[PDB]
Design an enzyme around this catalytic site. Sequence first.
Site, PDB file in Angstrom:
ATOM      1  N   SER A   1      91.044  72.721  41.969  1.00  0.00           N
ATOM      2  CA  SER A   1      92.494  73.461  41.490  1.00  0.00           C
ATOM      3  C   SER A   1      93.038  72.356  41.665  1.00  0.00           C
ATOM      4  O   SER A   1      93.470  71.865  42.880  1.00  0.00           O
ATOM      5  CB  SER A   1      93.314  74.410  42.407  1.00  0.00           C
ATOM      6  N   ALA A  69      92.678  75.170  46.747  1.00  0.00           N
ATOM      7  CA  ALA A  69      92.637  75.211  47.717  1.00  0.00           C
ATOM      8  C   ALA A  69      92.223  73.963  48.995  1.00  0.00           C
ATOM      9  O   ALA A  69      92.326  73.054  48.396  1.00  0.00           O
ATOM     10  CB  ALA A  69      90.509  75.857  47.285  1.00  0.00           C
ATOM     11  N   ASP A  73      88.767  72.065  58.318  1.00  0.00           N
ATOM     12  CA  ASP A  73      87.454  72.558  58.952  1.00  0.00           C
ATOM     13  C   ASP A  73      88.274  73.712  59.321  1.00  0.00           C
ATOM     14  O   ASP A  73      88.936  73.435  60.672  1.00  0.00           O
ATOM     15  CB  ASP A  73      86.647  71.415  59.478  1.00  0.00           C
ATOM     16  N   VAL A  75      86.026  76.628  60.318  1.00  0.00           N
ATOM     17  CA  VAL A  75      84.832  77.328  60.915  1.00  0.00           C
ATOM     18  C   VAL A  75      84.231  76.927  61.285  1.00  0.00           C
ATOM     19  O   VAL A  75      83.824  75.647  61.365  1.00  0.00           O
ATOM     20  CB  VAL A  75      83.660  77.707  59.511  1.00  0.00           C
ATOM     21  N   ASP A  76      83.382  77.250  62.658  1.00  0.00           N
ATOM     22  CA  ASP A  76      82.787  75.986  64.341  1.00  0.00           C
ATOM     23  C   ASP A  76      81.411  77.279  64.483  1.00  0.00           C
ATOM     24  O   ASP A  76      82.502  78.694  64.257  1.00  0.00           O
ATOM     25  CB  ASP A  76      83.621  75.693  64.735  1.00  0.00           C
ATOM     26  N   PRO A 205      83.288  68.668  65.432  1.00  0.00           N
ATOM     27  CA  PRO A 205      83.259  69.666  64.070  1.00  0.00           C
ATOM     28  C   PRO A 205      82.751  69.835  63.251  1.00  0.00           C
ATOM     29  O   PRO A 205      82.817  70.789  62.583  1.00  0.00           O
ATOM     30  CB  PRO A 205      85.120  69.443  63.833  1.00  0.00           C
ATOM     31  N   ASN A 241      92.490  68.973  44.955  1.00  0.00           N
ATOM     32  CA  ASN A 241      91.297  69.625  46.497  1.00  0.00           C
ATOM     33  C   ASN A 241      91.774  68.033  47.307  1.00  0.00           C
ATOM     34  O   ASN A 241      90.741  68.369  47.829  1.00  0.00           O
ATOM     35  CB  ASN A 241      90.381  70.113  45.870  1.00  0.00           C
ATOM     36  N   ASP A 252      83.731  70.724  57.189  1.00  0.00           N
ATOM     37  CA  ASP A 252      82.510  70.386  57.820  1.00  0.00           C
ATOM     38  C   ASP A 252      81.736  70.349  56.162  1.00  0.00           C
ATOM     39  O   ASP A 252      79.708  69.954  57.079  1.00  0.00           O
ATOM     40  CB  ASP A 252      81.918  70.857  58.619  1.00  0.00           C
TER      41      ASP A 252
HETATM   42 CA   LIG Z   1      83.047  72.620  61.521  1.00  0.00          CA
END
Ligand SMILES: [Ca+2]
EC number: 3.5.1.11
Lengths: 557, 193
Positions: A1, A69, A73, A75-76, A205, A241, A252
């Site tokens: 994007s 977008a 990171d 989300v873990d 991460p 992006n 990640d």
């Molecule tokens: Ca992560």
Amino acid sequence: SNMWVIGKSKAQDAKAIMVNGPQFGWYAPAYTYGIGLHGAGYDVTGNTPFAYPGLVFGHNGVISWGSTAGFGDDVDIFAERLSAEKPGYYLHNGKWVKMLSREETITVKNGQAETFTVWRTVHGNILQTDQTTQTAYAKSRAWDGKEVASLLAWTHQMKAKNWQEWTQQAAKQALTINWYYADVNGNIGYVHTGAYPDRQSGHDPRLPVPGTGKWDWKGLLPFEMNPKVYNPQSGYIANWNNSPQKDYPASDLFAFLWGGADRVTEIDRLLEQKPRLTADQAWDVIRQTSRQDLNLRLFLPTLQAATSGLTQSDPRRQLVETLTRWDGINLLNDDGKTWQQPGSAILNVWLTSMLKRTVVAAVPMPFDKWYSASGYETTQDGPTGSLNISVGAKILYEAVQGDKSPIPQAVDLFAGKPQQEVVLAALEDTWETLSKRYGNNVSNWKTPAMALTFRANNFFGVPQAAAEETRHQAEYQNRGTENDMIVFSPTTSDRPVLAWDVVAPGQSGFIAPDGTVDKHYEDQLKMYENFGRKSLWLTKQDVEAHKESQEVLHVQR
Amino acid sequence: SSSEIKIVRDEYGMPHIYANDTWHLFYGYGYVVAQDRLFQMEMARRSTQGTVAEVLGKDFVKFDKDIRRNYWPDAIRAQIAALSPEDMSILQGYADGMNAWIDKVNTNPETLLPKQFNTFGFTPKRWEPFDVAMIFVGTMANRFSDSTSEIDNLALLTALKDKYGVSQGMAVFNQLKWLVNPSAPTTIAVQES
Ligand SMILES: [Ca+2]
């Protein structure tokens, strides 16, 4: 994007220009929905994905906004410790804690129903469990419990009248998204928005952490930490992006990297080229970037150096000379099915061969399949989204940089052979493969062009239309699903703002019970294809002046 | 009037909503969305909640289970319950608007029902604020902000350690999946920050 925002100092015959091309795939009926909202403090025009209450793309006559977008990171994964005995429990801060669970029944049209349980811990829902290790993985999102606030921040930002008010809303958007600003005075801004964890020291991460307690995030980082720029020294803002700022860590995903080889360079090249840009010139960058081969620029120098001491009668030298003569812009032939130049076919075969000899060779099976793609993907319907530089190709670029690359080469990908020898061997493979299909006369190679398909199934693979509703475009265009342009203080008009968009196939997806298609079902499809655009109206007089119908409702709560 | 909602469509069919309050403004929006994109919206509702196998069958059971396992419905309801009445109006307005038009459609399906409901053999149901919120959650939060491969990265890393030994395996991991790369082209110039 992609997005390009041009400020006062770079703009010609306007004070600010905003061009957005959000890339979500191509669908029938359109991915986005056009809407204007006038009342209760709101006065906006634009379009937005799935007709969300807040408009992702648009303006309010004072400010304009857009998005791309983010890919930070956020989300873990937490490796939860289970006991063999005492089940549905997990160890957390030296106590056996009980999990949240819920039963679910899947009702099936013409089949038996199915029930299952969903489990959740302090860290998040359970992904998978390994009963052999006695480990369960919980997916932890930094935006958990701010989903609804993110929606509302996207709605309330439509009312902002300055940067100050706008950033108060940007601070409440918790998903990893880039937000862009422009105003009637020529001011431009950017914010890498989202909720990011405040991790424990020594937390890598990229890999899971124990969920027993010591590895638990400390909280979330403050909004002062979110990358942002206001009225940049360059006079513009470009994104495709790519990394927001120096040393900012990406998602990640093994398949996602921010390296020296990045497709945003293609946009920068064009914006630095002219001292000032008009709106038509700003719109025009969509056409050029739509058609640009992304690998040419990265590996042409490498191919040139390797074939420099070869003879003119050497086919491997011929192939590099073809590419040297080319600008990287793909154009269709008169047939509507083949490309004018064979460059992309050459680079695709070469790059696949290079990957197989280098990156793929260094990685154990079956992890080797993650690095083998050249990035020229497609099927008969063409690519499902944007064209990018593959992960393997970004890793090979660093290797061909040698010592100019900041990434320490732990394993020599060329496995003791001089670079030139691997390049020439891949070029021999290319020639052998292509010459076999098209012949020896490189000048009459008629290579297949990628196409564009407006799919009847939504991004999840679920039908949102009848199969017959699928639309096809001859030329694949690496561009937004929709494109919108906002021009503030045109010198060309009396109007303080001018805005355009294109929502293909059309505004409406309505088909009456008898098979009668709406008037606005596909009146934007041809406009899409030839880089056209329609005016977006804000003021009452413009709306009135262009009205095609009126409907008045009298409702009370 | 405060009861009045005026809907003006332009030459492309793009609707413009004129209303005096929040509930009336979002009601208008909901209403035109149900006019224009009802089948799309309905299929987007089932996709985001994992209810596709009900109308579509056997093939979507895995899809449905995967959607349901990736969220906690009750956590979403609790965020809705905590909204202020002005914030709550946006969502309620919207669902109400849509419902208004679904009632006419379900009243006169010989002329108003989207052809595809006949094709697929089902009909539209009424919407609630939870349904509107799930459209955004399911296609924005789960599509573009729920990205991880951490378990897969660990698998890869384990394979590199078995190939190059422990220290070497780790250094190759950093060559393939680096944390940061200082040569990456950035949106914000280094002089800025
Ligand atoms: Ca992560």
